[PDB]
Design a protein around this ligand. Structure first.
Ligand SMILES: Cc1ncc(NC(=O)c2cccc(C(F)(F)F)c2)cc1-c1cnc(OC2CCOCC2)c(N2CCOCC2)c1
Length: 269
């Protein structure tokens, strides 16, 4: 099974922490990432939140999904994943401002679409897809993860997630539908990731008020500016972006179509 016996993991450098967990770099048959719960004696809800996450990760076996490696219960409840040298797509695009070639931007898009197509086939709705959750292993291979460390009521069980408003579909901002999170809300988030790749920027860079952005997207008054895409961005890519970013969720394509469209436009370059 996937349970790792006590004393096998060497916990190293602390990377970060939030209200729910703390991530460390470690050693277990090579470099690993270790995410521990902040409490040693968890409540029935905290333990259920932990088991829910292990439950989703253990269903994944795909090169574009962060490789789950096992979990521990002793001395603490922890999740073990592969350790990746590299940086998140967010870090590359918006912090160090890496200038990838169009061919590589399309390659990153194709790889993300593969991982998302895989998750949706396993009935997993991510609910927090964004460039921060796309890791570039050796600055080349996409590893989709969920790197948030904050307490979330029913994360892998539902309720609205915050701090990722730029990637939030209009119906996710509103919270008026019977089921606001869907494969289509993940597709909208993916449409924002495509915008980040093709422009090198975060949407709505010219609006300095976050509350106004939330209000406007939800009302359907604001959409990303597609004329900001790089001069050599293929027309088929700009077309795909507009379909993913549709205000009405029913008008959005699903990942089998998205992946087929990227595979086809990557051939024509
Ligand atoms: C340890 C761990 N255990 C469980 C999860 N869970 C998930 O991903 C997860 C949970 C549920 C569903 C899914 C879905 F995507 F499949 F839908 C994924 C994440 C991490 C972890 C947190 N934070 C990290 O790094 C920080 C953030 C990046 O930048 C560096 C600091 C890493 N890395 C790994 C690469 O190598 C550098 C360190 C892994």
């Amino acid at each position: 099974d996937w349970e790792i016996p006590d004393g096998q993991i060497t916990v190293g450098q602390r990377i970060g922490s939030g209200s729910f967990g703390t991530v460390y770099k470690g050693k277990w048959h090579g470099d690993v990432a270790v995410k521990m719960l902040n409490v040693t004696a968890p409540t029935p809800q905290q333990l259920q939140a932990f088991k829910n996450e292990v439950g989703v990760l253990r269903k994944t076996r795909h090169v574009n999904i962060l490789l789950f490696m096992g979990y521990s219960t002793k001395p603490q409840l922890a999740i073990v994943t592969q350790w990746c040298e590299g940086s998140s797509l967010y870090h590359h695009l918006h912090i160090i401002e890496t200038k990838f070639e169009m061919i590589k931007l399309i390659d990153i898009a194709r790889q993300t679409a593969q991982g998302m197509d895989y998750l949706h086939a396993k009935s997993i709705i991510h609910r927090d897809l964004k460039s921060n959750n796309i890791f570039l292993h050796e600055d080349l291979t996409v590893k989709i993860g969920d790197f948030g460390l904050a307490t979330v009521k029913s994360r892998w069980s539902f309720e609205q997630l915050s701090g990722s408003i730029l990637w939030m579909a209009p119906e996710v901002i509103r919270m008026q539908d019977k089921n606001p999170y869907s494969f289509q809300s993940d597709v909208y988030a993916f449409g924002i990731v495509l915008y980040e790749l093709m422009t090198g920027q975060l949407p709505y860079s010219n609006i300095n008020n976050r509350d106004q952005i939330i209000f406007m997207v939800g009302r359907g008054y604001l959409s990303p500016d597609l004329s900001k895409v790089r001069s050599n961005c293929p027309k088929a890519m700009k077309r795909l972006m507009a379909e993913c970013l549709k205000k009405k969720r029913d008008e959005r394509p699903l990942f089998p179509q998205i992946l087929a469209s990227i595979e086809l436009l990557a051939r024509s370059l």
